[PDB]
Amino acid sequence: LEAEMAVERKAVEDQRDGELEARAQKLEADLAELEAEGAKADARRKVRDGGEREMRQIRDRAQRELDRLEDIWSTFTKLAPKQLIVDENLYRELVDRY
């Protein structure tokens, strides 16, 4: 069980890393395209802030997925009778996956 869901964790963290790398590459390409234009300092700061906030939001969503899966891991390992799952989404994920 540890082996199978360790490879499962490898797969989820790998798709998370792939999403992060793809988004980072897209943002880097956009930033380089902007730098090619050599816009004003005000425009440079505006676009840099926009891209930084977009990357922060992407990382926040990735961390949301990661902590969702970490809660899944804790609930499955720390699984015993007489336990409650208030959020039906969590239980649906558990049953559909495991």
From Swiss-Prot:
The lineage's top-level taxon is Bacteria
What does the record say about induction?
6-fold repressed by starvation.
Q: Which residues form a coiled coil?
A: none
Q: Which family does it belong to?
A: Belongs to the RNA polymerase beta' chain family.
UniProt subunit comment:
The RNAP catalytic core consists of 2 alpha, 1 beta, 1 beta' and 1 omega subunit. When a sigma factor is associated with the core the holoenzyme is formed, which can initiate transcription.
Q: What does this protein do?
A: DNA-dependent RNA polymerase catalyzes the transcription of DNA into RNA using the four ribonucleoside triphosphates as substrates.
Task: Supply the name of the protein.
Answer: DNA-directed RNA polymerase subunit beta'
User: What organism does the UniProt record list as the source?
Assistant: Mycobacterium tuberculosis (strain ATCC 25618 / H37Rv)
- Taxonomic placement: Bacteria, Bacillati, Actinomycetota, Actinomycetes, Mycobacteriales
Which stretch of the full sequence is covered here?
A: 151 to 248 of 1316
